[PDB]
């Protein structure tokens, strides 16, 4: 993902057309689904 | 007289074109018109009439 930011010229930020969001939605998936999830597991389950 | 005769002969002018922009509906050909051209050599500058 992110080391894709060391890209080229006209096919430039097209690899920054992500790897970043796929890190964002990943780091958000690793942070929001870290802080939350366990949160909404104790409340109402069974 | 030398100066004035230079720009009067070493000139790159702008003449139009045969069958121009508003045509006579029925025209078959179109060609850009070249009038005078800029002198290219030391010899052509020699033949400039005063």
């Amino acid at each position: 993902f992110v080391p894709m930011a060391f890209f080229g010229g006209s096919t430039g930020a097209i690899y920054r057309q992500f790897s970043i969001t796929i890190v964002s939605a990943m780091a958000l998936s690793v942070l929001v689904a870290l802080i939350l999830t366990p949160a909404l597991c104790a409340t109402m389950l069974k | 007289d030398v100066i004035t005769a230079i720009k009067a002969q070493n000139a790159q002018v702008a003449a139009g074109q045969l069958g121009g922009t508003p045509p006579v509906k029925g025209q078959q050909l179109n060609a850009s018109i070249i009038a005078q051209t800029r002198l290219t050599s030391t010899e052509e500058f020699g033949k400039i009439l005063l």
Partner: protein
């Protein structure tokens, strides 16, 4: 760990994200283009080889010290028109690459003939691809190509280009001019010349 703090952090990253979707409306691309700045000059009724030398070459000979830059191409035409497209590195400030070009044209400005000098010369940003084409057509009491092309410019072309981020409006036609069509026979009869 307790959950109500987390179901509050999830309230953010939601209205902080719903605040970023408020970039409504959202553009299609990615500025993938190596940015291009065009210089368009027009010698009225002039041939191809003339505008090549008296207009085109003057501008190219004066392009020195433009920051960044990749290359420059020419289009000295028979219609008496030329446009030099200066392409820059993908990511250069299109606002500063705009003014470098103009401030080298201002060095070659009085070297261009007074026929082409007053005709225009223009330095703007490029795309060569239209976002919209709004056709102004007629439905009754038909005005005509020449009539609409004037009004499309006389009433609403001025309102565009100056608006929200237009590079250059290429209007489909021409606004009116006081057209004088001389007769050489009627000129010669009274011993008169176009002059």
């Amino acid at each position: 760990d307790r959950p109500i703090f987390a179901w509050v952090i999830a309230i953010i990253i939601m209205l902080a994200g719903g605040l970023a979707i408020l970039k409504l409306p959202v553009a299609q691309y990615p500025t993938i283009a190596p940015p291009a700045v065009t210089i368009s000059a027009s010698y009225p009724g002039a041939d191809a080889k003339t505008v090549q030398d008296t207009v085109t070459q003057v501008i190219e000979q004066n392009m020195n010290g433009i920051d960044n830059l990749m290359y420059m191409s020419s289009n000295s035409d028979s219609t008496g028109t030329v446009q030099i497209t200066l392409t820059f590195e993908s990511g250069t400030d299109a606002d500063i690459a705009q003014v470098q070009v103009q401030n080298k044209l201002q060095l070659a400005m009085p070297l261009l003939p007074q026929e082409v000098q007053q005709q225009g010369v223009s330095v703007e940003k490029s795309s060569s691809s239209f976002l919209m084409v709004v056709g102004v057509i007629n439905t009754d009491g038909t005005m005509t190509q020449e009539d609409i092309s004037d009004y499309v410019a006389a009433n609403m072309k001025d309102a565009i280009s100056r608006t929200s981020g237009v590079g250059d409006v290429q209007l489909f036609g021409s606004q009116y001019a006081m057209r004088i069509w001389m007769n050489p026979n009627e000129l010669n009869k009274f011993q008169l010349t176009p002059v």
